Design an enzyme around this catalytic site. Structure first.
Site, PDB file in Angstrom:
ATOM      1  N   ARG A   1       0.846  -1.291   0.102  1.00  0.00           N
ATOM      2  CA  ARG A   1      -0.050   0.010   0.002  1.00  0.00           C
ATOM      3  C   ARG A   1       0.825   1.409  -0.039  1.00  0.00           C
ATOM      4  NH1 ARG A   1      -1.903  -3.466   3.222  1.00  0.00           N
ATOM      5  NH2 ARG A   1      -0.712  -2.550   4.881  1.00  0.00           N
TER       6      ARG A   1
ATOM      7  N   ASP B   1       1.848  -8.517   6.832  1.00  0.00           N
ATOM      8  CA  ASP B   1       0.930  -7.794   6.030  1.00  0.00           C
ATOM      9  C   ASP B   1      -0.309  -8.624   5.833  1.00  0.00           C
ATOM     10  OD1 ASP B   1       0.167  -5.545   3.521  1.00  0.00           O
ATOM     11  OD2 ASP B   1      -0.077  -4.862   5.827  1.00  0.00           O
ATOM     12  N   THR B   2      -0.398  -9.737   5.901  1.00  0.00           N
ATOM     13  CA  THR B   2      -1.746 -10.450   5.299  1.00  0.00           C
ATOM     14  C   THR B   2      -2.777 -10.784   6.258  1.00  0.00           C
ATOM     15  OG1 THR B   2      -0.696 -12.541   5.319  1.00  0.00           O
ATOM     16  CG2 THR B   2      -0.553 -11.368   3.055  1.00  0.00           C
TER      17      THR B   2
ATOM     18  N   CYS C   1      -1.097 -20.268  -2.054  1.00  0.00           N
ATOM     19  CA  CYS C   1      -0.532 -19.758  -0.854  1.00  0.00           C
ATOM     20  C   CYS C   1      -0.085 -20.943   0.145  1.00  0.00           C
ATOM     21  CB  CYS C   1      -1.598 -18.826  -0.086  1.00  0.00           C
ATOM     22  SG  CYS C   1      -0.470 -18.419   1.468  1.00  0.00           S
ATOM     23  N   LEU C   2       1.424 -20.784   0.481  1.00  0.00           N
ATOM     24  CA  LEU C   2       1.727 -21.887   1.194  1.00  0.00           C
ATOM     25  C   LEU C   2       1.405 -21.778   3.044  1.00  0.00           C
ATOM     26  CD1 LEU C   2       5.209 -22.256  -0.176  1.00  0.00           C
ATOM     27  CD2 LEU C   2       3.433 -24.124  -0.035  1.00  0.00           C
ATOM     28  N   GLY C   3       1.159 -20.635   3.312  1.00  0.00           N
ATOM     29  CA  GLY C   3       0.993 -19.993   4.625  1.00  0.00           C
ATOM     30  C   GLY C   3      -0.630 -20.157   5.013  1.00  0.00           C
TER      31      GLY C   3
HETATM   32  C1  HEM Z   1      -5.262 -14.191   5.139  1.00  0.00           C
HETATM   33  C2  HEM Z   1      -3.981 -14.480   4.945  1.00  0.00           C
HETATM   34  C3  HEM Z   1      -3.161 -14.583   3.492  1.00  0.00           C
HETATM   35  C4  HEM Z   1      -3.831 -14.287   2.092  1.00  0.00           C
HETATM   36  C5  HEM Z   1      -4.965 -13.930   1.775  1.00  0.00           C
HETATM   37  C6  HEM Z   1      -2.603 -14.792   1.274  1.00  0.00           C
HETATM   38  C7  HEM Z   1      -2.917 -14.685   0.121  1.00  0.00           C
HETATM   39  C8  HEM Z   1      -1.835 -15.226  -0.889  1.00  0.00           C
HETATM   40  C9  HEM Z   1      -1.989 -15.133  -2.459  1.00  0.00           C
HETATM   41  C10 HEM Z   1      -3.101 -14.607  -3.079  1.00  0.00           C
HETATM   42  C11 HEM Z   1      -0.721 -15.541  -2.907  1.00  0.00           C
HETATM   43  C12 HEM Z   1      -0.288 -15.867  -4.185  1.00  0.00           C
HETATM   44  C13 HEM Z   1       0.343 -14.800  -5.213  1.00  0.00           C
HETATM   45  C14 HEM Z   1       0.141 -15.035  -6.444  1.00  0.00           C
HETATM   46  O1  HEM Z   1      -0.363 -16.037  -7.045  1.00  0.00           O
HETATM   47  O2  HEM Z   1       0.987 -14.157  -7.125  1.00  0.00           O
HETATM   48  C15 HEM Z   1       0.016 -16.152  -1.782  1.00  0.00           C
HETATM   49  C16 HEM Z   1       1.337 -16.735  -1.912  1.00  0.00           C
HETATM   50  C17 HEM Z   1       2.182 -16.885  -0.840  1.00  0.00           C
HETATM   51  N1  HEM Z   1       1.888 -16.540   0.459  1.00  0.00           N
HETATM   52 FE1  HEM Z   1      -0.008 -16.274   1.252  1.00  0.00          FE
HETATM   53  N2  HEM Z   1      -1.437 -15.362   1.896  1.00  0.00           N
HETATM   54  C18 HEM Z   1      -1.735 -15.106   3.377  1.00  0.00           C
HETATM   55  C19 HEM Z   1      -1.000 -15.379   4.478  1.00  0.00           C
HETATM   56  C20 HEM Z   1       0.218 -15.931   4.532  1.00  0.00           C
HETATM   57  C21 HEM Z   1       1.229 -16.295   5.379  1.00  0.00           C
HETATM   58  C22 HEM Z   1       0.619 -15.824   6.970  1.00  0.00           C
HETATM   59  C23 HEM Z   1       2.442 -16.579   4.919  1.00  0.00           C
HETATM   60  C24 HEM Z   1       3.339 -17.127   5.497  1.00  0.00           C
HETATM   61  C25 HEM Z   1       4.076 -16.521   6.804  1.00  0.00           C
HETATM   62  C26 HEM Z   1       2.140 -16.443   3.423  1.00  0.00           C
HETATM   63  C27 HEM Z   1       3.172 -17.004   2.736  1.00  0.00           C
HETATM   64  C28 HEM Z   1       2.786 -17.144   1.037  1.00  0.00           C
HETATM   65  C29 HEM Z   1       4.021 -17.729   0.408  1.00  0.00           C
HETATM   66  C30 HEM Z   1       5.138 -18.213   0.774  1.00  0.00           C
HETATM   67  C31 HEM Z   1       3.492 -17.624  -0.893  1.00  0.00           C
HETATM   68  C32 HEM Z   1       4.098 -18.257  -2.306  1.00  0.00           C
HETATM   69  C33 HEM Z   1       3.837 -19.513  -2.820  1.00  0.00           C
HETATM   70  C34 HEM Z   1       4.346 -19.803  -4.075  1.00  0.00           C
HETATM   71  O3  HEM Z   1       4.785 -18.989  -4.775  1.00  0.00           O
HETATM   72  O4  HEM Z   1       4.749 -20.981  -4.304  1.00  0.00           O
HETATM   73  N3  HEM Z   1       0.733 -16.235   3.207  1.00  0.00           N
HETATM   74  N4  HEM Z   1      -0.542 -15.898  -0.562  1.00  0.00           N
HETATM   75  O1  LIG Z   2       3.848 -10.663  -2.896  1.00  0.00           O
HETATM   76  C1  LIG Z   2       2.924 -10.755  -2.472  1.00  0.00           C
HETATM   77  C2  LIG Z   2       2.092 -11.826  -3.009  1.00  0.00           C
HETATM   78  C3  LIG Z   2       1.021 -11.924  -2.215  1.00  0.00           C
HETATM   79  C4  LIG Z   2       1.425 -12.554  -0.674  1.00  0.00           C
HETATM   80  C5  LIG Z   2       2.194 -11.476  -0.042  1.00  0.00           C
HETATM   81  C6  LIG Z   2       2.154 -10.108  -1.222  1.00  0.00           C
HETATM   82  C7  LIG Z   2       0.617 -10.536  -1.682  1.00  0.00           C
END
Ligand code: HEM
Ligand SMILES: O=C1C[C@H]2CC[C@@H]1C2
Length: 405
Positions: free
Chosen positions: A177, A242-243, A348-350
């Site tokens: 943001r 931030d998520t 999303c892994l998280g």
């Molecule tokens: C409500 C919470 C969350 C939302 C809505 C969210 C959403 C997303 C989205 C939409 C993507 C894919 C972005 C793309 O396709 O360009 C993503 C990827 C990712 N997120 Fe989450 N996220 C959340 C929480 C988290 C948390 C807490 C972690 C780790 C501490 C995290 C780690 C990751 C990672 C490692 C990826 C990449 C996976 C890959 O590229 O193979 N996320 N997330």
């Molecule tokens: O770089 C990004 C991909 C999604 C998870 C964190 C932010 C929004």
């Protein structure tokens, strides 16, 4: 500040949407984006804002574009282009098959098995934070809970000092943001400056923390590099910081305004998991995109090589074709369709971590503070971008109706 329309863009496809400052913001961020789904808007549009880019407005196109990495590349996933260009996080800025090895590693750190390990702390912190708040009859939910809860769990996972939060949080905010205070490259540089010394330290004297695991991992039979680790960790921070923080505020803002939804979760706890998915659908908050690797005709629109397209993960679930009465929260929907955590190889892994943090919070907050509302005359402000947020959330309640556990 609209950029001149490129020659390949048919004027009937123009819709000047500003992802960073959408028109209807007052109504709420999801409502502000949902304008893209009105009958007057084509499924695929071009905005002249933020340098010019395409937006897919429907669940169907969003899912397809996500699956299609051959055409839609992760290489430059952020708008505006300069940000997308500076973006070099792993595994997000990579396509399959390269992505895969990096994903398998990040998975070791945030994956299912880590959740199962951290479960007791998550529950412990949630309970501690709420109990501490309870007797006060008033908070700033964003500063009081939304922020410390997830963040402290992250700091724990990462083995990073709580002291660093404010600094890290700011740089993270600038990335999702942007303010105008700093460019993406600048913010990125500052984050990297922070991390570098740490990675170095952990390559030498490894710990049991996420950073130590990433810094000393193996990818494609060989050791990860310092630069690779730094690029992974930079992503981990954005996700950690931030998520979940933003999501909780949107969910809580809603609960604060709907007594009947709170009651339902209090009496029918078996509904928490279903409710959590319904809040994820309704208060979805991510929007990134892809880059065209070549000239390609998609749903009859001609996309040129290098064009960027925003594939708002937030919009799939608000799509009427996907969910009947999308803006309505219904914990008993027969099928909750969303792509809140993404779709395709970058799923999303998280997500497992995020669901645990949400569910604990609902259960634990409702246990102790069943009746609360928004402070009288507080005007709640949303903020839009790559990840949308809530500015502040003043809540009030009567201590006399709370329950200590
Ligand atoms: C409500 C919470 C969350 C939302 C809505 C969210 C959403 C997303 C989205 C939409 C993507 C894919 C972005 C793309 O396709 O360009 C993503 C990827 C990712 N997120 Fe989450 N996220 C959340 C929480 C988290 C948390 C807490 C972690 C780790 C501490 C995290 C780690 C990751 C990672 C490692 C990826 C990449 C996976 C890959 O590229 O193979 N996320 N997330
Ligand atoms: O770089 C990004 C991909 C999604 C998870 C964190 C932010 C929004």
């Amino acid at each position: 500040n609209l950029a001149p329309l490129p020659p390949h863009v048919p004027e009937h496809l123009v819709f000047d949407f500003d992802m960073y400052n959408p028109s209807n913001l007052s109504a709420g961020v999801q409502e502000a984006w949902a304008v893209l789904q009105e009958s007057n808007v084509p499924d695929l549009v071009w905005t002249r804002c933020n340098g010019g880019h395409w937006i897919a407005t429907r669940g169907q196109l969003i899912r397809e574009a996500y699956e299609d990495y051959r055409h839609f590349s992760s290489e430059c996933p952020f708008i505006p282009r300069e940000a997308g260009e500076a973006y070099d996080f792993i595994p997000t800025s990579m396509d399959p098959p390269e992505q895969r090895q990096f994903r398998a590693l990040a998975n070791q750190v945030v994956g299912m098995p880590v959740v199962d390990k951290l479960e007791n702390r998550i529950q412990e912190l949630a309970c501690s934070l709420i109990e501490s708040l309870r007797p006060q009859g008033q908070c700033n939910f964003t500063e009081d809970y939304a922020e410390p809860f997830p963040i402290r769990i992250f700091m724990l996972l990462a083995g990073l000092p709580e002291e660093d939060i404010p600094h890290l949080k700011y740089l993270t905010d600038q990335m999702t943001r942007p303010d105008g205070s700093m460019t993406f490259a600048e913010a990125k540089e500052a984050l990297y400056d922070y991390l570098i010394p740490i990675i170095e330290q952990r390559r030498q004297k490894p710990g049991t923390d996420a950073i130590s695991i990433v810094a000393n991992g193996q990818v494609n039979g060989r050791p990860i590099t310092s630069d690779e680790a730094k690029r992974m960790c930079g992503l981990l921070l954005v996700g950690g910081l931030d998520t979940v923080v933003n999501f909780l505020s949107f969910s809580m803002e809603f609960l604060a305004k709907s007594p009947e939804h709170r009651q339902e979760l209090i009496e029918r706890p078996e509904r928490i998991p279903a409710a959590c998915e319904e809040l994820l659908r309704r208060f979805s908050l991510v929007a990134d995109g892809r880059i065209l690797t070549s000239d390609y005709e998609f749903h009859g629109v001609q996309l040129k090589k290098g064009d960027q397209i925003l594939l708002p993960q937030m919009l799939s679930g608000l799509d009427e074709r996907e969910n009947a009465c999308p803006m309505h929260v219904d914990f008993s929907r027969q099928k909750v369709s969303h792509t809140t955590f993404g779709h395709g190889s970058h799923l999303c892994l998280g997500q497992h971590l995020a669901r645990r943090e949400i569910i604990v919070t609902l259960k634990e907050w409702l246990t102790r503070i069943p009746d609360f509302s928004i402070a009288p005359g507080a005007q709640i402000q949303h903020k839009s971008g790559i990840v949308s947020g809530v500015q502040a959330l003043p809540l009030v309640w009567d201590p006399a109706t709370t329950k200590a556990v």
